[PDB]
């Protein structure tokens, strides 16, 4: 919300209300500099041990 | 001057939690706060003006009776009776023998308390417990 308008007023209200931010949107992750859960980031890429043995 | 620690002088009024402990070796009253600060590391000389007998923190115990002299009598009595223990049947009903034995153990306590002859009495106690 602070990324749009009333940046300081919103942040003060969150401090008084002790708001908890779960960092789901693009704005939170962009602020924190981490891959947002969008597009290619909407999933996790894991390593399959069951398949490594069978490709050789 | 009957409700304060002689060393730290922590009056009960300002420190209602103060608790006093006594040591069998010299039977001196010391508050719990002083015991930890001076004996936690290990044995040390008693913190009294004219007392140079070493003591350990583990030996401290709470005083039962309000008279220090009786405490010495009772604890010495307990130590003596731990070795000199007998009953009427031990002498097969010989009350005369039992009465003499009671005096002997009673006399031993008297000498040990007042230290008339510490060496002979303590040596006497040492030999009997093995039997």
């Amino acid at each position: 919300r602070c990324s749009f308008e009333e940046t300081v007023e919103i942040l003060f209200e969150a401090g008084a209300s002790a708001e908890l931010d779960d960092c789901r949107g693009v704005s939170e992750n962009v602020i924190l500099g981490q891959m947002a859960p969008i597009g290619t980031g909407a999933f996790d890429v894991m390593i399959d041990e069951e398949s490594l043995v069978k490709y050789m | 001057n009957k409700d304060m620690c002689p060393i730290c002088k922590t009056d009960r009024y300002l420190s209602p939690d103060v608790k006093f402990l006594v040591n069998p070796e010299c039977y001196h009253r010391i508050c719990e706060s002083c015991v930890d600060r001076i004996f936690s590391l290990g044995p040390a000389q008693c913190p009294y003006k004219g007392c140079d007998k070493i003591l350990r923190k583990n030996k401290f115990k709470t005083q039962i009776f309000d008279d220090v002299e009786v405490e010495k009598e009772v604890d010495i009595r307990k130590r003596v009776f731990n070795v000199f223990n007998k009953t009427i049947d031990d002498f097969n009903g010989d009350l005369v023998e039992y009465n003499k034995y009671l005096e002997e153990v009673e006399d031993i306590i008297y000498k040990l308390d007042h230290g008339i002859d510490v060496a002979k009495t303590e040596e006497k106690l040492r030999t009997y417990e093995e039997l």
Binding site: - | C8, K9, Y13, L14
Partner: protein, 185 residues
């Protein structure tokens, strides 16, 4: 007035003296606010009791602190290091403790010989401060009534012959306003 300021301010800070400001309306001059000073015994006794305990407690804590090992310090950066903290900063040869900021040998701290001096300090204060505890013991036995500006006026001995200040408490008629620390049981 300048010399009186420090005395009143410090006494007010310790709550040995209470203040009371009320609007006065002299019949012949424009109204001016007057300041009166008195003693609220529950406040002063409460303040005295806490301070006596704190001073005694501080010495006892300080006496206990002095019984612990001395410690260590760096002569250059003047940074104090505890025994635990100094152990992990020693050199490879394990012969002398080394500082972090300075990489210089440390120096053992003082206060090793004060084990008796602080005990003497505590002994003197308890003997000197005896009358306070005795007075407090009697105070606790009885019950004191909290003093107020109006109540204190009952024992007033006028200081001057024609003092300008009116030593009267005429509370404003039916006023619901309440000021901090201006009401007593």
């Amino acid at each position: 007035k300048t010399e009186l300021g420090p005395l009143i301010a410090r006494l007010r800070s310790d709550r040995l003296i209470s203040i009371h400001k009320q609007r006065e309306y002299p019949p012949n001059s424009k109204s001016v606010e007057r300041v009166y000073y008195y003693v609220k015994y529950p406040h002063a006794i409460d303040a005295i009791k806490w301070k006596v305990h704190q001073v005694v407690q501080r010495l006892k804590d300080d006496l206990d602190k002095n019984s612990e090992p001395n410690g260590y310090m760096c002569p250059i950066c003047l940074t104090k290091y505890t025994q635990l903290e100094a152990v992990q900063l020693l050199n490879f040869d394990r012969t002398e403790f080394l500082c972090s900021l300075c990489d210089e040998p440390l120096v053992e701290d003082d206060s090793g010989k004060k084990n008796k001096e602080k005990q003497d300090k505590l002994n003197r204060l308890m003997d000197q401060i005896q009358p306070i505890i005795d007075s407090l013991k009697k105070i606790d036995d009885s019950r004191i009534e909290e003093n107020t500006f109006e109540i204190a006026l009952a024992r007033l001995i006028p200081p001057q012959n024609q003092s300008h200040a009116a030593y009267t408490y005429n509370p404003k008629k039916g006023s619901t306003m309440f000021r901090p620390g201006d009401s007593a049981p």
